[PDB]
Amino acid sequence: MNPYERGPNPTDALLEARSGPFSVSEENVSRLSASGFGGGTIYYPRENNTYGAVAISPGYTGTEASIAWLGERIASHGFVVITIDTITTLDQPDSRAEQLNAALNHMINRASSTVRSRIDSSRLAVMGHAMGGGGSLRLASQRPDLKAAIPLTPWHLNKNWSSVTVPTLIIGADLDTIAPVATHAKPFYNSLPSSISKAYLELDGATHFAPNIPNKIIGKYSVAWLKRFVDNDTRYTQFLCPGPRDGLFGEVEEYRSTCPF
């Protein structure tokens, strides 16, 4: 009925697993093949179909290796995902925004036919870690046609994101000393309009480095957000609404959403 649906009916166990049901192959994007970003890796499902497409940016001083596990894991649930390097490791968030955009266009227009034929260019998403998450917010702001945005422990000097109407899941970490949730992630979530689809999930016992370490919470709710908004897959509403519990015996420090979507 929903022809964007891919994979079997979900459970906590399948969403928390290290790998989804799709086997994954990779396309290397060399620095000189890439226009407007530093190259990276495209993870894509071997099974021929069309899928939504995600661009992910690392943070200050980092490269694609620090978010590789995430590109693999998300692709293994039926998405085409690029993990980018930036032009320099020191690029600022609003520069990372522009480079994420360039990576979306690379996947759609300049990659091999193998990749291009597997992308529904109308269903795109953006993610990023730390300054990359800042880049996520800016691009989401600039491209309200994107289907989802997921800033992970995001970092940005601009705290006002009321121009964002893309469905946005911000993931904060309670022990993050580099982008403390009080001065970044929460003000980001709070300034996003109350009228859009958004959610704030704060990890419990997690540093700035948590998105760089295979993490079953991040993987589960990142895929669920993408399934729900890139594929319009309502089989995944159950994980977002009411969402993870932040109370007694809960899995999360804090979860806040505009459920129902």
Would you state the torsion angle of the CA atoms of residues 187, 171, 108, 102, taken in this order, to the nearest 10 degrees? 50
Question: Rounded to the nearest 10 degrees, what angle do helices 131-142 and 93-105 cross at?
Answer: 60
- 91/93 Cα distance (integer angstroms): 7
Assigned token pair, 218? 């991040």
Contact between 257 and 198 (Cβ < 8 Å): yes
- 81/103 Cα distance (integer angstroms): 10
- 152/225 Cα distance (integer angstroms): 13
In 3D space, the residue among 186, 256, 178 whose CA is nearest the CA of residue 210 turns out to be 178
Assigned token pair, 102? 């360039």
Per DSSP bridges, beta strands 51-57 and 168-173 are: unpaired
- 56/34 Cα distance (integer angstroms): 15
Resolution of the coordinates in A? Answer: 2.4
Q: How many CB atoms lie within 10 A of CB 35?
A: 11
Domain boundaries, the chain: 1-261
Amino acid at 69: W
- 140/154 Cα distance (integer angstroms): 13
- 19/15 Cα distance (integer angstroms): 8
In 3D space, the residue among 65, 76, 212 whose CA is nearest the CA of residue 133 turns out to be 212
In 3D space, the residue among 55, 85, 70, 66 whose CA is nearest the CA of residue 24 turns out to be 70
Per-residue b or e along 49-66, where b marks 16 or more CB atoms closer than 10 Å to that residue's CB: ebbbbbbbbbbbebbbeb
Experimental technique used to determine this entry: X-ray
Assigned token pair, 54? 């995600």
- 253/251 Cα distance (integer angstroms): 7
